[PDB]
Structures are given as structure tokens and as C-alpha cells.
Design a protein around this ligand. Structure first.
Ligand SMILES: C[C@H](O)COCC(COC[C@H](C)O)(COC[C@H](C)O)COC[C@@H](C)O
Ligand SMILES: Cc1cn([C@H]2C[C@H](O)[C@@H](COP(=O)(O)OP(=O)(O)O)O2)c(=O)[nH]c1=O
Ligand SMILES: Cc1cn([C@H]2C[C@H](O)[C@@H](COP(=O)(O)OP(=O)(O)O)O2)c(=O)[nH]c1=O
Ligand SMILES: Cc1c[nH]c(=O)[nH]c1=O
Lengths: 137, 137
């Protein structure tokens, strides 16, 4: 069971003028968008991430190219490749992630429920396991 | 000159792991994000747009590739090429726009101040110029 994770399907409005996916805060995703960020130009052998959050809710969306997201909780690990812009990966609190195999020119957009707060990140895998084992076991 | 438009510069957090640009509503941009949408897979000879808005505020960002934005208000026209993910084109009310020259792989993100409202759009060019003449002249 990969708790606290979902794949959310967005509208894809396509005709001869291209494709357009809209995402409205609290409607298409469950939370209000306080912040967005996006990661570009990642080299092919980079893994990034190596963190969880305590309170943040987030949605990951690969808008070009492809990227693989490795998700861990105590005793499970699942790899999800994102390669469709109409699909978002919801990740709740206390899921550990790492991202790798970003293609050229892969674009990974994140919608976040809160402003950037370094103190809400768990960057220590040992602390992570320690807080997570309490939640998931 | 071209009223109600700005270029906004965002952080670019660049290192060996790649590049990351964050945008926090009301901080990096002047409004809350209620809605984001994105345009992709647009063919090379397509022109998108041909409208204005009455009340919406929005920011345009090209996250991969390049796209040109033709902006017009009565008596004034400017073409802006967007090709830097760390640069946002803020467009306020009553500017007419058209988007063209989407490159292969181009991703155009829009941050919007309101949920989609087809009644806020001005799609009739003659009603646009009539309303804009009232404001800018
Ligand atoms: C270059 C090396 O191969 C990468 O090693 C990754 C790391 C974490 O994985 C934790 C989870 C099981 O995946 C290995 O640590 C062992 C423990 C946590 O001390 C820590 O690296 C963080 C850096 C890359 O920012
Ligand atoms: C996500 C985010 C990061 N940053 C900073 C924090 C980090 O030092 C750097 C990279 O963030 P980090 O979250 O470590 O990136 P990733 O998940 O891709 O590994 O950017 C901000 O200033 N604002 C933000 O919203
Ligand atoms: C921007 C937006 C458009 N749409 C729909 C309305 C239109 O039928 C279609 C195309 O939108 P439009 O804004 O008309 O496209 P552009 O300015 O890129 O030419 O998508 C939404 O459903 N939600 C949105 O947020
Ligand atoms: C000049 C002009 C006329 N008609 C349009 O629809 N757009 C334009 O930009």
C-alpha cells in the first residue's frame, strides 16, 4: 500500500490549436495553490529530491518529456514515471521522494499547498524513517 | 507605450542538480494564484489567443522552448519572445493578445488571478477596441 499518494486526471482541451490543461485550486486538486515551482534542465544522471514534508500537500506534473519519481514509505517503494501533462501525482505528508531519469527538456511543475518553509522539510532519511514508522506501522 | 504589461524576474536556483524556479502567490507575483493552466504540443504555424480580459490578471511563462506573444492596445503593439523559464510576462486587463511561433516542445504556463470565466473574455476585436479606447485614450 502506497499511502498518501494519488494520480489525478485533469482535463485536456485539444483540437488543432494544441493542448491546454487548466487546474483550479480546490476544484481540480483538493487544496488551494499557494505556490508553484518548476524544475528544468536536469542532467540525465541526476537524482534530486531526497526529502519528505510534514504538512505540505503537493501535486507533481510532467509537462514535457519524462521523469521518474521514486516514492518511499517504511517498507514500500514504488516508481512512477510521469510523461503526460494531463496527469498529476498527488503526494501527501510523510512520503519520501526522489526524482531521476529526467529527459531532455523535461519540465516538472509542482503545485504546492503552502509557501516554502524549510522547517517543514525532513531531509534526513533517518529522522524520516523515525517519524514515518510511527505513522505507517 | 504598452500599459498594463510587465516582465517579472523570478529566482533561478541553478546548480549541478539542475534549475528550479519558485513562484509564491502575492510574493513573487502581485496576486493570489487561483488557477494555473498550460499549453503544449502546439503546431508551428498556429496562432492562439485573439482576446483580452476585463478583470483577470495573469502571468505567462515559457518553461521550455520559445513562444512569441503579440500584445496590442489601441495604437501600440509589441512582440515579446518568451524563452526563459525565470521570466514572467504579466498582462493586466484590456490588453489584447495573440501567441505564435511555438517551438517544438514548447510549454507555456499561465498563472491566473481568478477561476476560468468565459464572460470575462473579450473575443470580439471590435468590442475590444471600443472598450480599450475608453480606458487608454
Ligand atoms: C551518491 C549516493 O549514491 C546517494 O546516496 C543517497 C542517500 C539517501 O537515500 C535514502 C533512501 C533509502 O533512498 C544515501 O544515504 C544513506 C543514509 C541516508 O545515510 C543519502 O543521500 C542524500 C544526498 C544524495 O543528497
Ligand atoms: C521548492 C523551493 C525550493 N527553494 C530552494 C530550496 C533548495 O535549496 C533549492 C532546491 O530545493 P529542493 O526542494 O531541495 O529541490 P528538489 O526537490 O528538486 O531536490 O531551492 C526555494 O527557495 N523555494 C521553493 O519553493
Ligand atoms: C484558459 C482556460 C481555457 N479553457 C477552455 C476554454 C476554451 O474553450 C479553450 C481554449 O481557451 P482560450 O483561452 O480560448 O485559448 P488561447 O487563449 O490559448 O487561444 O479552453 C478552460 O476550460 N479553462 C481555462 O482555464
Ligand atoms: C489588426 C488585427 C485585426 N484583427 C484581428 O483579429 N487581430 C488583429 O490583430
Amino acid at each position: 500500500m502506497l499511502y498518501n499518494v494519488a494520480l489525478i486526471k485533469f482535463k485536456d482541451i485539444a483540437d488543432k490549436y494544441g493542448h491546454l490543461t487548466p487546474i483550479e485550486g480546490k476544484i481540480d486538486i483538493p487544496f488551494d495553490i499557494k505556490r508553484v515551482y518548476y524544475i528544468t534542465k536536469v542532467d540525465k544522471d541526476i537524482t534530486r529530491g531526497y526529502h519528505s514534508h510534514k504538512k505540505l500537500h503537493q501535486v507533481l506534473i510532467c509537462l514535457n518529456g519524462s521523469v521518474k519519481i521514486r516514492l518511499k514509505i517504511p517498507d514500500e517503494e514504488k516508481i512512477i514515471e510521469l510523461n503526460d501533462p494531463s496527469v498529476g501525482l498527488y503526494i501527501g505528508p510523510l512520503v519520501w521522494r526522489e526524482m531521476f531519469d529526467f529527459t531532455e527538456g523535461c519540465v516538472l511543475l509542482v503545485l504546492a499547498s503552502e509557501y516554502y518553509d524549510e522547517t517543514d522539510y525532513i531531509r534526513n532519511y533517518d529522522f524520516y524513517i523515525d517519524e514515518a514508522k510511527k505513522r505507517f506501522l
